[PDB]
Nucleic acid binder design. Structure first.
Ligand SMILES: [Mg+2]
Lengths: 387, 137, 59
RNA sequence: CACAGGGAUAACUGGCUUGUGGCGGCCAAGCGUUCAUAGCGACGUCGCUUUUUGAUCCUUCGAUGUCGGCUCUUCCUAUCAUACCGAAGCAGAAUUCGGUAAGCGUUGGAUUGUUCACCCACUAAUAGGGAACGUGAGCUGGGUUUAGACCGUCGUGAGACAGGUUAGUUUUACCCUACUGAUGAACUCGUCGCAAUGGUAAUUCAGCUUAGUACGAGAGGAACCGCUGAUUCAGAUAAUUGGUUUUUGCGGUUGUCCGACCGGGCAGUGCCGCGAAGCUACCAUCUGCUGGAUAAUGGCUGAACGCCUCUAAGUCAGAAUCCAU
RNA sequence: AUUAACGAGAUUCCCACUGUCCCUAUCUACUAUCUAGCGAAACCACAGCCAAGGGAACGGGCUUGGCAAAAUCAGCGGGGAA
RNA sequence: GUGAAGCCAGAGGAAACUCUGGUGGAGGCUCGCAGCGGUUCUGACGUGCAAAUCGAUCGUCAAAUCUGAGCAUGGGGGCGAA
C-alpha cells in the first residue's frame, strides 16, 4: 500500500560514493575555457589554510534594508608563500581523449621537490635528476631544444609544473607539493615561450589574482571515523521505548524487489571526501614585507593580522595572504587549492567593490578583549613583574 | 483581493516561540495572556511545528481576561521575545518576557497604548504599532 | 565603528562580542562575556567583586 | 481439553471471471431566453481496470507470524499545485472544458484502537494508488483471538451471544547472498595525467515599481522586464552566541579520618559557581552553472485537387521534458 | 437507592514540572574492537547474481537474454516463502 | 505522629448545668528501617548467574504478622478465605 504522508528524501544521491578520497591533495578536474585573444596568464594557485576572523564594513546595495550601514561578516585567511616553476607539459587531441607526450624539466632542482619522489629520503642516495642534468651542457642542449619545438608544432594545450616552498611556513613537514597549472595565452608559440622564461624563478600570487573577484576553492573535507545512520544522512530517531537499538532506520526495503537497494541509508564513513566550493569573494591580498597589513583607511593602528598568540594549532603568518568571505572545506594546516572561476558574474552582488573598515585581531584562544599588547598594557596598568 | 497578512521584507532571525506558547499581552484591550494556534507565513513539512518571532502575525485566542473576548480567535502580533537573536550589525539581544498585542487583519491595533519596550523590527513593519509605542529597543 | 564599556565590570567591548540585555523597566545592560552576565543575574553586588574596575577605583 | 489424520475441506496472500464497485466512449429526444453538441444528456448500446464486494477451492494444515499506527526507499497516471498552450454564453478580475507533461511538492491539531469519517488553522496545493491488502529475528501491543472476573437476554442445568466492560510473557543471526564501507597477490619502485562507464539537484512564494494604469457606465482591477527578501532541500565551516565539563583548572561548602594550622584521603564524579580546548545547532555562519535536440501549439514556401491548405517533399520558433556541461 | 473514611482498582479536567516532542547535541564507566591463553551450540538434499516466460497459477537450478576476475575485515537486518 | 476512657485544678451561672488548662496512653489507626510480598518499567538477560534470576520504583510493618522441630489427612482419595 502507498505511503501515508509524503516527505522529501534524506540526503542527496549526486554525491554518491561516500568513501575516503583517493589522494590527499585536491584535484582540479577542469580549467576555464581557453580564449586566444587575451594575454598569457596562469589560471590557478595553491596555499595553506590558517584560520578565520571577523571584519566590519559598509554595504553598497541600492534597494536593500541595510544599504549604507555597517555589517559584520566572517572571513578566512589563507597563507600563500610563492611558488617556483619547474617545467611544462604539452597535450594533443586524440579520438580517445587528450594525452601528454613530452616533459622538459629545469636544470637544477631543490631538495624540497626531490624529497617528493622518495618515501625514505634519509637512507637514500638522492639521485633523482642526476643523469637528466647531463642533457644540459651536452651538445649545447640539443636534446632539450628539440622537445620544445615538438610542443610548438603538435601540441594544443600547455601546462606548467610548480611547487611550493614549505620551508617558509610553521609546519613540521618538509616535503613540498607539486601540481600543474594551465596557461590560456593566445597562441601555442607564445604560451611555450612565456613558460620557458619562468623557469626556476618565483612567481607571486598578486600577479595571478586581483582584489574583489570571484574564485573557486578545491580541498578535502574534515574527517570523522565511522558514524551511524542518524548522523550520516540525518534521519529521525525512533521512540524512547524501542528494543534492540534506537538510533537506526526501521524499514530498509519492501519484500520485492527482494534485495536491499543502493538508495537506502546505511552506516559507514563520514568525511574526508573531495569537494569543490564555488563563488567565493576576495576581500584583500596582503603583502608580507608590509608591517601594517591589518590596518585600514579609518583605523590607523599599526598591526599585523596574526592574533595575540598565533592562530590556534598553527604558527604565524609572515608571507602573503588572501582574505575570502565565508568558509572553505578543510581543517587548519591542510593544503588548500585556489583556481579561477568558470562562470560569468553579472548579479550586482558579485560585482560589488569592497572597502573594509576594521579587522579583528583579538585572541581566539578565549574571550579576548584587546587588540594589541600596547593597548592591554596602557589599560591594565602596572603589574608586580614589571619591577 | 484581501492580501493574506504577512510582513514583506522581513529578514530571518531565530524563531523563539512555537505553537502552544502562552505569551503576555501588553495593551489596554482587556486581555492578559494569548494562546497561539497558528502562524501566518508558515510552510509545510512533516512533523515540524510552526513557529514565529518578533514582528510577524499570529492567530491566537485568549484564555484569561474580560469574558467578552474569550472563546474566539483573534489575529495578533508579537512585539518582544525572550530568546537571543542577532541583527545585521552583529549584536545579540533579548528581553525578559514574551508579549503581543491584538490587531485587525488590515493592521490596526485594537487597544490604544503599549506598556513596555518594543523590538525595532515590529516598529518598521507595522506603522500603527510604531506610532503608538514608547521606547523601541 | 564604535566601542562600548561593560556595565557590570567596565571591560571594553568591540563590535560583535558580548550581548545586550533589556530589563523590564526599559533599562539596557551590556555584558562583555558570560562571566559578567551570570554574576549580574544572581543579584550580586559589583562593589564586593575584587576584579571589577569599580571595585579598584572605590579602593 | 486430548489423539490419528486432511490442503480430498473453511478463515489471509497468490491465480482465472467481473455480476456488483470504479472509470471512459457511440446515436441524439431535449435543457441551455432564440439555437442538439460553450457546458450537459433521457430511451438504448460498446468497452477498460483489479485500490470494493461476490463465485470457485488450483497451491500451503510434520505451521508462509493473522488489525492499526511509527520510520524509509521506489514505482504508476485516471493531473490538486508548479511550466507552456488550445476553447467559452472568455470586457477586467474570479472561473469552467481540453493537450504536451510524473522533473518537483502535497501540512499542523481536538474525538475514536480504528482503516473510514467529521470539525479548527495555515498554504501555491493540502490528488488517487501499488510493492505477498510493502514493512513484527524493525518497534509498539490500543483491538480482535486462550486461561481470571462483572452485567443484560436465552437455557431446568452444564453453558451460549460477528452484545458491553476490566487485567493479561512478543524468543534466536556469528552462516550464504544483498547492501554500506575498508585491505589486497601477479608484470621492478615511484611521481604527474587522460576518461570508457555509473550517479546527478534544486524548488516555490512574498514585498517595491510597472499601476490606481490597460479593460469597464460604475463598482472593481491585471501582466513581462527590473530590484530586494523568504519557505522546503543539498554540501561545508566554527571568528562571534548558545549547549556539553574528567582540564576533576580555580574557588565555596557538609560529614568523617590524618593530635591542631598548612596540605590532604573517602562519600563509584560528595555537592554548588565560573570554566578554556575539542565536538556541535535553519538555536549559529557561507555557497547551490548553461549548451544541444524536441513534444503540444502557433507559423513560412507549397502540390495533390486550375482555387485553398502548417505536410505530402523542404523548413522556423518552442515547455519545469530528454541528452550533455 | 444514597453514602463519610479507605484503594499499587477503571475513567475526565486543572496548577507546578520536565528531552515525551519541535530537533537534536555532548560527557563518563563496561563491552563490542586488536593481541596472548582457553574455546562451544543451533542448523545443513546440492548449493548460493538478476529480468521476463511457462510451470503445482510468486525459481538458486529449466528456456531466452543481462552479464561475469584470486583471498579477505567491521556493520546491517531485504531474501533464503530462515 | 495523632491523642479514646479514667484522674487533678480553675472559671461562669439564681438554678439546671456548662466551659478552660493539665495528667494518662486506647486503636484488627498512621509515616518509616530489618523480615514478608511481588504493582510498574510490559527495563536487564532470554543456547542466561538462574528450567523464573538481576536493578530501580512499590504493598504491609504490633497483628486475620513471620518462622523452626514433632504429629495427622493418601489418588475418584486429601486439602482448599474458591
Ligand atoms: Mg478607482
Amino acid at each position: 500500500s502507498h505511503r501515508k504522508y509524503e516527505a522529501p528524501r534524506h540526503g542527496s544521491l549526486a554525491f554518491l560514493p561516500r568513501k575516503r578520497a583517493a589522494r590527499h591533495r585536491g584535484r582540479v578536474k577542469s580549467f576555464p575555457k581557453d580564449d586566444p585573444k587575451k594575454p598569457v596568464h596562469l589560471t590557478a594557485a595553491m596555499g595553506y589554510k590558517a584560520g578565520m576572523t571577523t571584519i566590519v564594513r559598509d554595504l553598497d546595495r541600492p534597494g536593500a534594508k541595510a544599504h549604507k550601514k555597517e555589517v559584520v561578516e566572517a572571513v578566512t585567511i589563507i597563507d600563500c608563500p610563492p611558488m617556483v616553476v619547474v617545467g611544462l607539459v604539452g597535450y594533443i587531441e586524440t579520438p580517445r581523449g587528450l594525452r601528454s607526450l613530452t616533459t622538459v624539466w629545469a636544470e637544477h632542482l631543490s631538495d624540497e621537490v626531490k624529497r617528493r619522489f622518495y618515501k625514505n629520503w634519509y637512507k637514500s642516495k638522492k639521485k633523482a635528476f642526476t643523469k637528466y642534468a647531463k642533457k644540459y651542457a651536452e651538445n649545447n642542449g640539443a636534446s632539450i631544444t628539440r622537445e620544445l619545438e615538438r610542443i610548438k608544432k603538435y601540441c594544443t594545450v600547455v601546462r606548467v609544473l610548480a611547487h611550493t616552498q614549505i620551508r617558509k611556513t610553521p609546519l613540521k613537514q618538509k616535503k613540498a607539493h607539486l601540481m600543474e597549472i594551465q596557461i590560456n595565452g593566445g597562441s601555442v608559440a607564445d604560451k611555450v615561450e612565456f613558460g620557458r622564461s619562468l623557469f626556476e624563478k618565483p612567481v607571486t600570487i598578486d600577479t595571478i589574482f586581483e582584489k574583489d573577484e570571484m574564485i573557486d576553492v578545491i580541498a578535502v573535507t574534515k574527517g570523522h571515523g565511522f558514524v551511524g545512520v542518524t548522523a550520516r544522512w540525518g534521519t529521525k530517531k525512533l521512540p524512547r521505548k524501542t528494543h534492540k537499538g534506537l538510533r537506526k532506520v526501521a524499514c530498509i526495503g519492501a519484500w520485492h524487489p527482494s534485495h536491499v537497494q543502493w538508495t537506502v541509508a546505511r552506516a559507514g564513513q563520514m568525511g574526508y571526501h573531495h569537494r569543490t566550493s564555488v563563488n567565493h569573494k576576495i576581500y584583500r591580498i596582503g603583502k608580507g614585507d608590509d608591517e601594517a597589513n591589518a590596518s585600514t583607511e579609518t583605523d590607523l593602528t599599526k598591526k599585523k593580522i596574526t592574533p595575540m598568540g598565533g592562530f590556534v594549532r598553527y604558527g604565524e603568518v609572515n608571507n602573503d595572504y588572501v582574505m575570502i568571505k565565508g568558509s572553505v572545506p578543510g581543517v587548519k594546516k591542510r593544503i588548500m587549492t585556489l583556481r579561477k572561476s568558470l562562470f560569468t558574474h553579472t548579479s550586482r552582488k558579485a560585482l560589488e567593490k569592497v572597502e573594509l573598515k576594521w579587522i579583528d585581531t583579538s585572541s581566539e584562544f578565549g574571550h579576548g578583549a584587546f587588540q594589541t599588547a600596547a593597548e592591554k598594557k596602557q589599560f591594565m596598568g602596572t603589574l608586580k613583574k614589571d619591577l | 483581493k484581501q492580501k493574506r497578512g504577512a510582513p514583506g521584507g522581513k529578514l530571518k532571525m531565530t524563531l523563539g516561540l512555537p505553537v502552544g506558547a502562552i505569551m503576555n499581552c501588553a495593551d489596554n484591550s482587556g486581555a492578559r495572556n494569548l494562546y497561539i494556534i497558528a502562524v501566518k507565513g508558515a510552510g509545510a513539512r512533516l512533523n515540524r511545528l510552526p513557529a514565529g518571532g518578533v514582528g510577524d502575525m499570529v492567530m491566537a485566542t485568549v484564555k484569561k481576561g474580560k469574558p467578552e473576548l474569550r472563546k474566539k480567535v483573534h489575529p495578533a502580533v508579537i512585539v518582544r521575545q525572550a530568546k537571543p537573536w542577532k541583527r545585521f550589525d552583529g549584536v545579540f539581544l533579548y528581553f525578559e518576557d514574551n508579549a503581543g498585542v491584538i490587531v485587525n487583519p488590515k493592521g490596526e491595533m485594537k487597544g490604544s497604548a503599549i506598556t513596555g519596550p518594543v523590538g525595532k523590527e515590529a516598529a518598521e513593519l507595522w506603522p500603527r504599532i510604531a506610532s503608538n509605542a514608547g521606547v523601541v529597543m | 565603528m564604535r566601542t562600548y564599556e561593560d556595565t557590570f565590570s567596565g571591560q571594553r567591548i568591540y563590535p560583535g562580542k558580548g550581548k545586550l540585555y533589556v530589563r523590564g523597566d526599559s533599562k539596557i545592560f551590556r555584558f562583555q562575556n558570560g562571566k559578567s552576565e551570570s554574576l549580574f543575574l544572581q543579584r550580586k553586588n559589583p562593589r564586593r567583586i575584587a576584579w571589577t574596575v569599580l571595585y579598584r577605583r572605590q579602593h
